[PDB]
């Protein structure tokens, strides 16, 4: 069962909760944006249905300053590492993404690293910062261990996604971005709630059995007992090695350059400290230094035109391409709403009650 | 059966090729040093075993202009585009590469782009150099219509490599180098000469048909009627448009930026010039403008040895990183020589015959 709640609706309560539990103003309303970004474009699990558990729970047990701004440990021209203060991810995510655009737009190109952060939300959001500046914008982060590399049989690496945004001349951008593991941690909590059994390949207990129920995985991996497999699976014969490497790729950027915790170090300085403290690095590529915006938009289109135009597999109605799954949820939500799990309209109501910020309902 | 050459050997044999060939002398030595770090490294398909047809019978077509090096378009700080004037792809490879680092030592960050190129060889190469120089090294390439998008029945996109080369503690850096699909084309030329059967998931015919006959790809794959799966294969469910999408990025950034032929029109301006004309794209970061340069190989290090020592999957002796497989055999290699198919020693042998380059057998 569900309840339909606006978009604006959902926007505004998430700011005024954010408030009411001692954010910085400019803090709310960039964690909000980034936040209602994950609902507008359909990524369920990023946005309102994990704002009680994932943040305010969170801010709660300390484990997020909410008034936190990122710190400058050493900028040149084109480059930054940002101490994140254990602010929200989203903070320093977009001021990040910002400076790293500004770099590119004054150089033609930019990258902050940002270290001592918490979770960020979507990867896709700063990448789309990027694209809107007519920039191309790559950024990723790391997260606690959940995947095995190839030929492991324990979770050390975070789902570690990577987020690539180009500038289109279309209604949307281009816009990937995913886990470098096959599944996100989320998609399985997802499909616990609507009692779902998951693909075969998405993940496997200790020794490599395959799992069918959700639940195995989301208890077992923090006991270092299940894990999820990368992109490509769990051979190299379906291509395992490729998403792995691209997995520590990720880590790498987003740990090495910035000194932040890196692979077991989150989940271990977790049970130390009490905060989930993880790094993120925001690259932005200025288009105008190499061709005209609207030339480059042009042939990125006629990529995707050609694309979608290709013979079609029987079964298959048409071919997408990145971010416009995205696109057409996020003009369906604009307009209609968000039909939301009666948990999350639970958690509203709670949120409501506890900080005396009104809801319609 | 096959016959053992000294790395030495090869090294000196296709440069001499080269020259008797009419290539510069400075591109003869360029192009071997990127074709032998192939052979060095075990990529097999992309050395001398493919010298004579990939190259020299290139350069014979007219295909290659062989004295040409690459013209500045339009040059920034930290940006250039290159025209690669139908020269050798590892001629402008390495010179936009160099490229790269020069402008990211002097600003941290340096991206070049080319157009009207050739095949560049192996994409880990570029990276190679610039991990060497304690930057991190990302290009890729694009390449003619051999893999179907997601839901797609057609051959419309390369195989469009991604390689990342970045610092380590170790006696060798971090090097991902691969197609975005499971397999390159070349692979599938290899088992037809060992004959031996393809995975399934790397192909199908028209319609959607796996393939397990190595030849039936090769024959209607430049037809139109089979094609390769990007990384993640066919179906969503295995993560199939995220090689897909990680495809489409490689291209974009290959062609979108340097204006250079993209998916289909690769194939369809050869069949009117005579010239396969490509795009790649180098981009070069500069550690040292975040970080120490020890501390971050350090750090990588770390990560690598962490990676290594996780629960190995039963039947299974060890877990890899990036570019291992690649410095094992290139230590075998360098003191034990390669052992080469018939085919290339009498490729070799009629090389020899033609431009009186001698041989030791
Ligand atoms: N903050 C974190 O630590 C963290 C960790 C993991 C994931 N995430 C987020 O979770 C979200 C979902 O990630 P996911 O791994 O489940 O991704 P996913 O499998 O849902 O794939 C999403 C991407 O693939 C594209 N796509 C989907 N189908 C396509 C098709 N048929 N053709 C072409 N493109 C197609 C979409 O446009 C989008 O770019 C992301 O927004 C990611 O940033 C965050
Ligand atoms: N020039 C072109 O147009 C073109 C096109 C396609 C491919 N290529 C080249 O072909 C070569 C082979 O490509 P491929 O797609 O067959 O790659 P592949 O499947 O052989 O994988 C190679 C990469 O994966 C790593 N790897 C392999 N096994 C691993 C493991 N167990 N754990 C961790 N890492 C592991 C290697 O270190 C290497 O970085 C590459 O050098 C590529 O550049 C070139």
Redesign the pocket.
């Known amino acids: 069962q569900t309840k339909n709640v606006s978009i604006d609706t959902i926007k505004e309560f998430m700011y005024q909760v954010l408030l009411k539990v001692g954010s910085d103003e400019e803090n709310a309303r960039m964690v909000r944006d980034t936040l209602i970004a994950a609902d507008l474009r359909g990524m369920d699990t990023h946005g309102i249905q994990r704002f009680k558990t994932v943040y305010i729970d969170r801010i709660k047990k300390g484990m997020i300053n909410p008034t936190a701004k990122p710190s400058i440990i050493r900028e040149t021209s084109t480059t930054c590492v940002l101490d994140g203060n254990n602010g929200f991810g989203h903070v320093n995510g977009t001021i990040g993404m910002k400076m790293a655009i500004e770099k590119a737009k004054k150089y033609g190109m930019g990258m902050v690293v940002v270290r001592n952060s918490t979770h960020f939300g979507i990867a896709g959001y700063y990448s789309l910062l990027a694209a809107q500046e007519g920039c191309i914008g790559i950024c990723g982060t790391n997260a606690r261990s959940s995947v095995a590399?190839?030929?492991g049989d324990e979770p050390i690496l975070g789902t570690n996604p990577l987020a690539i945004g180009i500038p289109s001349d279309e209604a949307f951008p281009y816009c990937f971005d995913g886990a470098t593991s096959i599944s996100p941690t989320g998609r399985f909590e997802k499909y616990v709630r609507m009692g779902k059994t998951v693909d075969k390949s998405w993940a496997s207990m200790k020794g490599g059995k395959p799992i069918e129920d959700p639940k195995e995985l989301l208890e077992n991996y923090p006991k270092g007992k299940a894990y999820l497999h990368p992109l490509g699976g769990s051979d190299?014969v379906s291509?395992?090695?490729?998403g792995?490497?691209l997995s520590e790729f990720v880590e790498i950027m987003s740990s090495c350059l910035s000194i932040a915790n890196f692979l077991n170090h989150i989940e271990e300085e977790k049970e130390k400290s009490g905060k989930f403290s993880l790094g993120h690095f925001f690259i932005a590529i200025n288009v105008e230094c190499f061709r005209d915006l609207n030339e480059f938009k042009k042939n990125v289109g006629d990529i995707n035109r050609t694309l979608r135009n290709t013979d079609k597999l029987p079964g298959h109605d048409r071919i997408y391409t990145a971010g416009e799954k995205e696109y057409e949820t996020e003009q369906k939500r604009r307009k209609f709403g968000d039909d939301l799990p009666l948990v999350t309209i639970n958690e509203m109501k709670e949120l409501s009650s506890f900080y005396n910020v009104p809801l319609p309902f």
Do not use: D, I, L, N
């Open positions: 590399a190839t030929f190299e291509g395992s090695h490729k792995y490497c």
